[PDB]
Design a protein around this ligand. Sequence first.
Ligand SMILES: *[C][C@@](*)(*)C(*)(*)(*)(*)(O*)(C(*)(*)(*)(=O*)[O@@](*)(*)*)C1(*)(*)(*)=C(*)(*)(*)([C](*)O*)C(*)(*)(*)(=O*)N2(*)(*)(*)[C@@](*)(*)C3(*)(*)(*)=C(*)(*)(*)([N@](*)(*)=C4(*)(*)(*)[C@](*)(*)=C(*)(*)C(*)(*)(*)(O*)=C(*)(*)(*)([C@@](*)(*)N(*)(*)(*)([C]*)[C]*)C4(*)(*)(*)=[C@]3(*)*)C2(*)(*)(*)=[C@@]1(*)*
Length: 494
Amino acid sequence: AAWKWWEEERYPEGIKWKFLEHKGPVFAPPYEPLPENVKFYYDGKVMKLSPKAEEVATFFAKMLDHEYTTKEIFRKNFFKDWRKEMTNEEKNIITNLSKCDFTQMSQYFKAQTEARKQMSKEEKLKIKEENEKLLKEYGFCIMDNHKERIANFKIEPPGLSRGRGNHPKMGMLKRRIMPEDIIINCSKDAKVPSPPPGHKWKEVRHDNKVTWLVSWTENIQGSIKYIMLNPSSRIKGEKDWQKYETARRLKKCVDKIRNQYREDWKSKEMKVRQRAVALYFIDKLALRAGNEKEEGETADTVGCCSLRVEHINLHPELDGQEYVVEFDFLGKDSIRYYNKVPVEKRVFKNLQLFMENKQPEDDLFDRLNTGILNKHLQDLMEGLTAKVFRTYNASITLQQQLKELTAPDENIPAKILSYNRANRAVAILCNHQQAPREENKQIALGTSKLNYLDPRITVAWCKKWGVPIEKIYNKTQREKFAWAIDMADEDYEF
DNA sequence: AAAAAGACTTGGAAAAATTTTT
DNA sequence: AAAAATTTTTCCAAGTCTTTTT
Ligand SMILES: *[C][C@@](*)(*)C(*)(*)(*)(*)(O*)(C(*)(*)(*)(=O*)[O@@](*)(*)*)C1(*)(*)(*)=C(*)(*)(*)([C](*)O*)C(*)(*)(*)(=O*)N2(*)(*)(*)[C@@](*)(*)C3(*)(*)(*)=C(*)(*)(*)([N@](*)(*)=C4(*)(*)(*)[C@](*)(*)=C(*)(*)C(*)(*)(*)(O*)=C(*)(*)(*)([C@@](*)(*)N(*)(*)(*)([C]*)[C]*)C4(*)(*)(*)=[C@]3(*)*)C2(*)(*)(*)=[C@@]1(*)*
């Protein structure tokens, strides 16, 4: 029988668990060497590469078809990192990447892909059965009286970094994660997981103030990557329920907050004027609270608080509309945001004052960062941060649009059209793009449907119109939103 | 403070598995 | 059979906000 964690007494703040036991992470499949017939060339002559160098060479060979393997930054980074993985004998022969011929390696990898879909019933069924025994042995964990699923237990294989957009580190080598890089987290009364034969873990800790099971440091950015519980668990779902509850508490406080920031545009001090114009953008246009990145780590992308002077172009009268602000920046994942939006009279006058005596490279809202904006938002409502406005706007627009687009006389397949049409409006507001059915050509429903929309709004909609939840939510989503699907009436109001 | 770390939050695109069209 | 159009898993990062160092 399935566990209804939502009927339980809410888990206390501070300590995340009392008990934790798991079988550790599943390491990336080992490197299968190149056979004798698959040769590498340098200056037209054959050259057998050492195992370490040959492994790095394969990553490039597999990506050879893409246009990014011809870029300055990619090639510079790849070659620099391939030098480290070479022997002193190889370092003296291989001076540049351009005299290297990977074409034969590339052909073998295409040949293996063509040979992988031609497998028998003893190969196609066997590998899918060894994946199932792996899913049941390492894909589950015990955390406080119950067996819950683990998210991504299979650690990512080594390769070359690409990232999203115009990334400075594209082409850098993602190293193979070893047991000696793993920090295991579990309880003192639990059976500490066994490392692969011949190896030992980096650390075995017992921190109950955190929710992760396994952690390590990746080399590209230096940040800690984690292995946590799947979305269907108590620890993730309760936090997901609390996120929506916070957005619901902002609903009965928004009119009071909107009136306050409208008055703040007139204030004597500029520290308050900028804070209010930035909050106006976050409320109206659902922008992300733009944190400050370190120059040269990730692609140059901004958000609301990190907006520069060059990202906006002021127009008093354009297209027959008053006070137009033309936004043109790259948001998260290098997705372009473009909107010609008519603002209030005081907001336009304020933006003119913020763009004065400044160069294009300078920050628009100086004397303001994400911490100052969130410190103020905490003084208005408890637990309020800038991303709560995005959750609020997305969820309320779905509720509003579902009421507006669903009609009583329509059939079940036609009602699904209306749900997806309401979901479309949420994706346009949140700027969730999908690169090139005529409507949803450039729009992506996935991100909002799972991160942004209180699932109870959908469960309420479904029980009202007689649409079974399986027509809206698939197998995996139904498990993530189980709390909502069980506990929720037709009368749910955000 | 205020930089740096740490711990959460937020798929779409490319491939492979099928299914349908020629 | 053989190819094309769909469906569906496999591949791969980047923000937000909190907590620690410097
Ligand atoms: C595409 C879309 C995005 O980007 C946004 O929007 O933001 C995303 C999402 C949504 O929300 C999600 O969810 N996700 C998850 C994940 C991702 N990415 C990635 C990359 C890489 C890797 O490796 C991974 C895995 N790990 C293990 C965690 C991932 C995941 C995203 C995105």
